[PDB]
Write a protein that holds these residues in place. Structure first.
Motif, mmCIF file in Angstrom:
data_model
loop_
_atom_site.group_PDB
_atom_site.id
_atom_site.type_symbol
_atom_site.label_atom_id
_atom_site.label_comp_id
_atom_site.label_asym_id
_atom_site.label_seq_id
_atom_site.Cartn_x
_atom_site.Cartn_y
_atom_site.Cartn_z
ATOM 1 N N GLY A 68 -6.214 -7.494 -65.373
ATOM 2 C CA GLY A 68 -5.472 -8.170 -64.341
ATOM 3 C C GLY A 68 -6.221 -7.977 -63.083
ATOM 4 O O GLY A 68 -7.507 -8.055 -63.065
ATOM 5 N N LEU A 69 -5.729 -7.653 -61.849
ATOM 6 C CA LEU A 69 -6.291 -7.556 -60.720
ATOM 7 C C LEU A 69 -6.632 -5.835 -60.251
ATOM 8 O O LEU A 69 -7.800 -5.777 -60.232
ATOM 9 N N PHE A 70 -5.778 -5.132 -60.400
ATOM 10 C CA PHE A 70 -5.811 -3.751 -60.092
ATOM 11 C C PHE A 70 -5.664 -2.734 -61.163
ATOM 12 O O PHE A 70 -4.913 -1.943 -60.722
ATOM 13 N N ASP A 71 -5.862 -3.061 -62.352
ATOM 14 C CA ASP A 71 -5.606 -2.422 -63.501
ATOM 15 C C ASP A 71 -5.808 -0.919 -63.349
ATOM 16 O O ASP A 71 -6.863 -0.155 -63.034
ATOM 17 N N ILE A 72 -4.971 -0.107 -64.004
ATOM 18 C CA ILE A 72 -4.951 1.280 -64.221
ATOM 19 C C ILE A 72 -4.454 1.447 -65.602
ATOM 20 O O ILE A 72 -3.476 1.284 -65.986
ATOM 21 N N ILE A 73 -5.541 2.043 -66.661
ATOM 22 C CA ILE A 73 -5.175 2.415 -67.820
ATOM 23 C C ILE A 73 -5.422 3.948 -67.870
ATOM 24 O O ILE A 73 -6.405 4.548 -67.441
ATOM 25 N N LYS A 74 -4.267 4.559 -68.073
ATOM 26 C CA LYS A 74 -4.315 6.028 -68.484
ATOM 27 C C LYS A 74 -3.903 6.556 -69.874
ATOM 28 O O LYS A 74 -2.934 6.024 -70.107
ATOM 29 N N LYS A 75 -4.744 7.417 -70.477
ATOM 30 C CA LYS A 75 -4.488 7.775 -71.603
ATOM 31 C C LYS A 75 -4.545 9.128 -71.644
ATOM 32 O O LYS A 75 -5.517 9.758 -71.235
ATOM 33 N N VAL A 76 -3.695 10.184 -72.131
ATOM 34 C CA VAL A 76 -3.668 11.546 -72.001
ATOM 35 C C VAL A 76 -3.251 12.124 -73.258
ATOM 36 O O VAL A 76 -2.178 11.896 -73.809
ATOM 37 N N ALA A 77 -3.636 13.308 -73.940
ATOM 38 C CA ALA A 77 -2.901 13.983 -74.893
ATOM 39 C C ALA A 77 -3.382 15.600 -74.718
ATOM 40 O O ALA A 77 -4.414 15.981 -74.559
ATOM 41 N N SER A 78 -2.428 16.634 -74.578
ATOM 42 C CA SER A 78 -2.729 17.834 -74.220
ATOM 43 C C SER A 78 -1.771 19.123 -75.109
ATOM 44 O O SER A 78 -0.730 18.713 -75.615
ATOM 45 N N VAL A 79 -2.465 20.143 -75.047
ATOM 46 C CA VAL A 79 -1.956 21.319 -75.927
ATOM 47 C C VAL A 79 -1.811 22.413 -74.463
ATOM 48 O O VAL A 79 -2.662 22.944 -74.072
ATOM 49 N N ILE A 80 -0.464 22.974 -74.202
ATOM 50 C CA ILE A 80 -0.342 23.595 -72.933
ATOM 51 C C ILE A 80 0.294 25.035 -73.837
ATOM 52 O O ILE A 80 1.361 25.011 -74.100
ATOM 53 N N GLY A 81 -0.262 26.186 -73.463
ATOM 54 C CA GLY A 81 0.085 27.630 -74.149
ATOM 55 C C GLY A 81 1.536 28.075 -73.288
ATOM 56 O O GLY A 81 1.593 29.523 -73.441
ATOM 57 N N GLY A 82 2.467 27.468 -72.897
ATOM 58 C CA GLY A 82 3.312 27.892 -71.853
ATOM 59 C C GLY A 82 3.138 27.394 -70.605
ATOM 60 O O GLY A 82 2.122 27.671 -70.058
ATOM 61 N N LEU A 83 4.261 26.921 -69.917
ATOM 62 C CA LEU A 83 4.389 26.641 -68.399
ATOM 63 C C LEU A 83 4.642 27.853 -67.804
ATOM 64 O O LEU A 83 5.212 29.035 -68.355
#
Lengths: 16, 16, 16, 16, 16, 16, 16, 16, 16
Positions: free
Chosen positions: F1-16
């Motif tokens: 398109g004109l102003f594309d954002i593609i964001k892909k993420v995956a995470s393992v967090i040991g507790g917040l």
């Protein structure tokens, strides 16, 4: 509290 | 409380 | 309370 | 047996 | 057996 | 398109 | 389109 | 067995 | 597009 333990952990292991 | 344990864990393991 | 244990865990395991 | 393949897998993928 | 393959895997991928 | 954002993420967090 | 956002995410969290 | 392969793997990849 | 951002991420955090 009186005797607090806070433990947070995360890990990647390549096979046991 | 008096004797608190808070444990938080998350893991990725490549096979046991 | 008096003797609190709070345990939270979440895991991905590549086969046992 | 004779020609055994045992495959075990589990994964988290952040978007394909 | 005779020709055994055992494969165990687990992964976190940040986007393909 | 004109102003594309593609964001892909995956995470393992040991507790917040 | 004009102003596209594509967001893909997947996560394992060891407790909040 | 005779010709054993055991493969165990786990990985974090920051995007392909 | 015109102004593309592609962001891919994956992480292991030992507790926040």
């Amino acid at each position: 509290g009186l005797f607090d333990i806070i433990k947070k952990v995360a890990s990647v292991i390549g096979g046991l």
